[PDB]
């Protein structure tokens, strides 16, 4: 079952009384039909933010940005694959030394790395726009629908994956934590793998900059919790991998006997 097949949040169209209420309001708005009206006080028109029309429109804008961001990521890999194919197939009539091949190789790596970061940064802007569109859906009922949770996880996942590639690890922590609070994403070991690395980065920065000891411990404890959880979710509890991590964490943490 695909929740994004129809590309909509909630399908908008039953009671006889409700059908009568809808009839009289439509008649009233016809009397005061004035397309040039602009509400001086914004409170009343802002109630349109709670409508189903508004939520559908915001959902489709976020969907449009999400698709564009994924297109940015996917087209880049297509270009990188094509670029490597073209480089290997062209004739090198002036290359005869091993260090020349190493030199030619390094340029291709620099070109590829340069383009990848540009694609990641371009895609991240699309995802950040997609994130903002969903945040202004103010209706809690529409936020619990399967379609909303399907897109919300996909937008969060791609944004987290891209932001990590730009080495902006501490920014992924707030988004990752909101990711594992939706449906059963908490049982995914990749989610806890990223949090282990991200909190390790925070721990080093406090150690390096000689920050507060309290923040040093909190980043260390959060690092161990998600490191152990990721090990359990992938290799299982009381597994050889799990026993290895417990020895590491106990050695790293401070305990009292």
């Amino acid at each position: 079952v695909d929740e994004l097949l129809k590309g909509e949040l909630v399908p908008e169209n039953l009671t006889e009384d409700q059908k009568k209420k809808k009839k009289e309001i439509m008649e009233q708005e016809s009397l005061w039909k004035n397309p040039d009206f602009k509400g001086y006080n914004k409170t009343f028109q802002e109630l349109h933010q709670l409508s189903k029309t508004f939520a559908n429109n915001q959902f489709r804008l976020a969907l449009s940005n999400y698709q564009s961001g994924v297109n940015t990521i996917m087209k880049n890999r297509d270009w990188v694959e094509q670029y490597r194919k073209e480089e290997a197939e062209k004739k090198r009539l002036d290359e005869k030394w091993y260090w020349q091949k190493v030199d030619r190789k390094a340029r291709e790596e620099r070109v590829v790395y340069r383009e990848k970061m540009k694609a990641k940064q371009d895609a991240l802007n699309y995802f950040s726009k997609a994130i903002n569109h969903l945040d202004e859906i103010k209706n809690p009922d529409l936020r619990e629908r399967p379609e909303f949770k399907r897109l919300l996880s996909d937008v969060y996942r791609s944004w987290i994956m891209a932001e990590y590639d730009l080495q902006n690890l501490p920014q992924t922590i707030p988004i990752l934590e909101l990711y594992i609070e939706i449906d059963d994403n908490e049982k995914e070991y990749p989610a806890h793998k990223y949090l282990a690395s991200a909190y390790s980065f925070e721990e080093n920065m406090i150690k390096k900059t000689k920050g507060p000891d309290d923040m040093l411990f909190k980043y260390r404890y959060k690092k161990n919790v998600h490191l152990l959880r990721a090990t359990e979710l992938k290799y299982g509890k009381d597994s050889p991998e799990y026993k290895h991590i417990v020895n590491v964490i106990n050695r790293d943490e401070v305990i009292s006997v």
Binding site: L124, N125, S128, K129
Partner: protein, 56 residues
Amino acid sequence: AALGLRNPTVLTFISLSTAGKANSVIGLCDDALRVISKQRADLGAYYNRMEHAAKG
């Protein structure tokens, strides 16, 4: 943000803590300098026309 020295969306501004980054910033300042120069030109052009009008 308008001079290209800061992302209007994410709001991160340019950095020089990496040699590779600094090379790309050199191009960024060239476009930043061009935008200011293009702006000062239009202001001076307005001043010249206004100067003629007052004499007229």
